[PDB]
Design an enzyme around this catalytic site. Sequence first.
Site, mmCIF file in Angstrom:
data_model
loop_
_atom_site.group_PDB
_atom_site.id
_atom_site.type_symbol
_atom_site.label_atom_id
_atom_site.label_comp_id
_atom_site.label_asym_id
_atom_site.label_seq_id
_atom_site.Cartn_x
_atom_site.Cartn_y
_atom_site.Cartn_z
ATOM 1 N N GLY A 110 24.445 86.823 31.620
ATOM 2 C CA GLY A 110 23.558 87.819 32.198
ATOM 3 C C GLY A 110 23.708 87.851 33.707
ATOM 4 N N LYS A 111 23.781 86.673 34.318
ATOM 5 C CA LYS A 111 23.954 86.607 35.765
ATOM 6 C C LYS A 111 25.302 87.217 36.132
ATOM 7 C CE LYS A 111 21.440 82.251 36.570
ATOM 8 N NZ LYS A 111 21.543 80.968 37.319
ATOM 9 N N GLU A 163 22.382 69.697 38.478
ATOM 10 C CA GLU A 163 21.290 70.492 39.018
ATOM 11 C C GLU A 163 20.183 69.475 39.246
ATOM 12 O OE1 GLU A 163 22.438 74.558 36.556
ATOM 13 O OE2 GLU A 163 21.017 73.097 35.740
ATOM 14 N N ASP A 206 21.047 79.761 41.530
ATOM 15 C CA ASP A 206 19.957 79.025 40.902
ATOM 16 C C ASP A 206 18.731 79.904 41.082
ATOM 17 O OD1 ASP A 206 19.689 76.344 39.585
ATOM 18 O OD2 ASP A 206 17.964 76.190 40.937
ATOM 19 N N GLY A 229 16.704 85.704 29.321
ATOM 20 C CA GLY A 229 15.620 84.805 29.675
ATOM 21 C C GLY A 229 14.214 85.367 29.604
ATOM 22 N N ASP A 257 13.040 87.964 30.972
ATOM 23 C CA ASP A 257 12.927 89.407 31.180
ATOM 24 C C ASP A 257 11.894 90.125 30.305
ATOM 25 O OD1 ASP A 257 14.645 89.510 33.322
ATOM 26 O OD2 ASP A 257 16.398 90.143 32.156
ATOM 27 N N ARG A 303 17.475 88.948 42.091
ATOM 28 C CA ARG A 303 18.926 88.781 42.170
ATOM 29 C C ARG A 303 19.558 89.934 42.947
ATOM 30 N NH1 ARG A 303 19.348 87.462 37.505
ATOM 31 N NH2 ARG A 303 19.137 85.281 38.187
HETATM 32 O O1 LIG Z 1 16.735 87.774 36.161
HETATM 33 C C1 LIG Z 1 16.252 86.849 35.327
HETATM 34 N N1 LIG Z 1 15.489 87.263 34.170
HETATM 35 C C2 LIG Z 1 14.946 86.353 33.235
HETATM 36 N N2 LIG Z 1 15.110 85.000 33.373
HETATM 37 C C3 LIG Z 1 15.840 84.620 34.474
HETATM 38 C C4 LIG Z 1 16.402 85.439 35.459
HETATM 39 N N3 LIG Z 1 17.047 84.718 36.403
HETATM 40 C C5 LIG Z 1 16.880 83.416 36.008
HETATM 41 N N4 LIG Z 1 16.157 83.330 34.850
HETATM 42 C C6 LIG Z 1 15.736 82.162 34.038
HETATM 43 O O2 LIG Z 1 15.533 81.023 34.915
HETATM 44 C C7 LIG Z 1 16.387 79.998 34.277
HETATM 45 C C8 LIG Z 1 17.570 79.985 35.125
HETATM 46 O O3 LIG Z 1 18.322 78.861 35.512
HETATM 47 P P1 LIG Z 1 18.730 78.137 36.777
HETATM 48 O O4 LIG Z 1 19.457 79.120 37.641
HETATM 49 O O5 LIG Z 1 19.625 76.941 36.359
HETATM 50 O O6 LIG Z 1 17.517 77.645 37.503
HETATM 51 C C9 LIG Z 1 17.002 80.405 33.074
HETATM 52 O O7 LIG Z 1 16.107 79.894 32.124
HETATM 53 C C10 LIG Z 1 16.782 81.868 32.942
HETATM 54 O O8 LIG Z 1 16.454 82.349 31.670
#
Ligand SMILES: O=c1[nH]cnc2c1ncn2[C@@H]1O[C@H](COP(=O)(O)O)[C@@H](O)[C@H]1O
Lengths: 186, 186
Positions: free
Chosen positions: A11-12, A36, A65, A141, A143, A169
């Site tokens: 997704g990212k 992390e 992150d 996630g 969303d 983002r």
């Molecule tokens: O744009 C987004 N929408 C929904 N969840 C996000 C989004 N960005 C990060 N997350 C959530 O935050 C957590 C991200 O991981 P991290 O970057 O390792 O801290 C993951 O569980 C994702 O599902």
Amino acid sequence: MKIFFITSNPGKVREVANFLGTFGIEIVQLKHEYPEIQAEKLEDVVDFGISWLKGKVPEPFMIEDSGLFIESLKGFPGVYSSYVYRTIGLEGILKLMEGAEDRRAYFKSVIGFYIDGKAYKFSGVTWGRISNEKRGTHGFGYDPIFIPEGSEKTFAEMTIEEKNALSHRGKALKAFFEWLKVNLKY
Amino acid sequence: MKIFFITSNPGKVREVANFLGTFGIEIVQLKHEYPEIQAEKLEDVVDFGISWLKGKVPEPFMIEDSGLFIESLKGFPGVYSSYVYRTIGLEGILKLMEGAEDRRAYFKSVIGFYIDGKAYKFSGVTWGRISNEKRGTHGFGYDPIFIPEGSEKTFAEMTIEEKNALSHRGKALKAFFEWLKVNLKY
Ligand SMILES: O=c1[nH]cnc2c1ncn2[C@@H]1O[C@H](COP(=O)(O)O)[C@@H](O)[C@H]1O
Ligand SMILES: O=c1[nH]cnc2c1ncn2[C@@H]1O[C@H](COP(=O)(O)O)[C@@H](O)[C@H]1O
């Protein structure tokens, strides 16, 4: 210009590639798990991540992150949004928020960028609130339960273009791109 | 639902049809030649191909392009992987890589899809390194000199099942499907 995005989140990848692709920048995803660390800020996780990755992956590279910080829960899940998502899930968040007098929260994204022995961080914040029930199937996630300020739809009810125009983002990417424009050829 | 795959590659059709058929999607090959432009990015080849095909073939339709990008060769052969294989061959790649300590490389696949007036792209990437010599008899193209990250075997030394589990095109197809599952009815 081609940037290697060290991440395991598809997704990212789509969101970053869609945003930067507009300006002719290519993104090449590279899955390479990095430590992390537990820390107070997403920025700390990114700092340690870059320091760890340098010399082990192609350059220039970027990492990201992000997290959801719920006001009534004192910022939780925040830096540990991933663990919480994979354990108690969205259902858990909704259960915790039952009867809440304040459902506000903010999403934050921190992008780490490394090139030629130099490390940078860019970030973005988008305020909003937690929906009462899951809505939408787009994105990933949290969303389905996050409604950005001013909107009636959750991120999951939006197209990737709409989400990038309002999300944490998209904001981090804008800050990053504005920096790129006055530093690197692209 | 049916998706028209514009290509003249029998092996590619089989792979794509086999993958998407798992989810009730019927792939129909259409041998309609289209311009594959010279470019540094697979994304540009796909964008141009889709824009050119618009109105010339039934919808919805898809195309795909991939290549091997070698770090020490500034990304070469990349978009020109087929031509390079047919001319200088694996012998040529190994010759160019003689003495190179950094033998990192990656395969990247980009799928283009057109439906209801909009184009979409999806990618898959598999990292690895170039071997010092040709090994294996399975697969095709550069398989004899590409060792995927996490393995000691070259793609050519792997069975089709083992390679498919690590395939860059397989990853692009997965991303494409996750998008289809959320965006289209069928
Ligand atoms: O744009 C987004 N929408 C929904 N969840 C996000 C989004 N960005 C990060 N997350 C959530 O935050 C957590 C991200 O991981 P991290 O970057 O390792 O801290 C993951 O569980 C994702 O599902
Ligand atoms: O799994 C693979 N093994 C060997 N070569 C590959 C592979 N994937 C892509 N290629 C190279 O990239 C070419 C171009 O690809 P296509 O556009 O995906 O059909 C082929 O001619 C090969 O030379």
